[PDB]
Amino acid sequence: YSAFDFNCPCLPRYNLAYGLGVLLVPPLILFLLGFVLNNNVSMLAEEWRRKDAAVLRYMFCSMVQRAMIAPAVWVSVTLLDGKCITCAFCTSLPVEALPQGEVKRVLARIPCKEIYDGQELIANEVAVRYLRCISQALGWCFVLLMTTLAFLVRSLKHYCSPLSYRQEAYWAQYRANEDQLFQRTAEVHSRVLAANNVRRFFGFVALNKDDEELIANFPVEGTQPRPQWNAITGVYLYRENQGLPLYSRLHKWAQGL
Template structure:
């Protein structure tokens, strides 16, 4: 029926038109539900395999998650303060003064910022991170790795991180 143009459809076939449309709808819904079931099963299996193939124990993985969450929260709060103080410094340099409220004035005096981090430092702590250890000690994030002065050693794992960014 799909090969016959609508205006040239024989009347004997028109009687089956509703049945064909209904069957196509059933088939498309069936295929859709099968696709949803396959994707859900694949996600479930991947989550199970992720825990089975992880080099971390259950408790260490829980700690890693806690660490990353705390690091992200502290980094974001500190970055916000740093950006605000640096912006206030730049505005003051441009205008000769800056209009700050009491809380911001205290923040500017408490946390003096003179320089921003260079691009190589940002590049070292930014990006996808795959868990690894260095001399038996865990490195929980790229920032942790940078703080321990392990970054930039040209390991294969680091090139994997960068390859993931390139994809």
């Protein structure tokens, strides 16, 4: 926000297409960053590559809700600082309350230019005041819309997701824990396999304390093959088997065999 100096094209047609630009595009960027920086995007890409609409829509509407939080605050802070709409809806504030070509020209010259004629068209500061007024008004209205939508979507999306609230918490915590344990175990298993491979070539492997302990405790020969490995990955449905639930594709493949 700092290294990007907001400046205005004092032009009769390039304001409408610049205020809306600086108001909409950075939100889109923060939004798409909310996806790329997240990791479950790859899970969803896999799922749509190769389960029913219920749980899929649930994870969709959870990822979106988790990502929408950057553009909300950005739009809020900018639309409230006023400068955007000032630069944007300047070619249209009616002269009836405060050469068409020259009219539009000077009106576009209004915002933060001080090349303004300051003449019988409009005074300088009164126009800035009116525009910052309408801007801040729309900004508060937008923040209201966003928060009331957050409330209503809380309710109606706890209606969407098939599980109740407590299972929601349990499922979230389980996904987190399984992911972390899988990461760490994968690292350790990999280090062991690499140590065995190197040892079979050189004759020994220089290891510090903890690595030597990990080699001693968990000997490993061969990692799971590719078919089952591929069978693991993906986003899982809550597969409510008769009497027992399933929380992740790993859990399904485990209980199944």
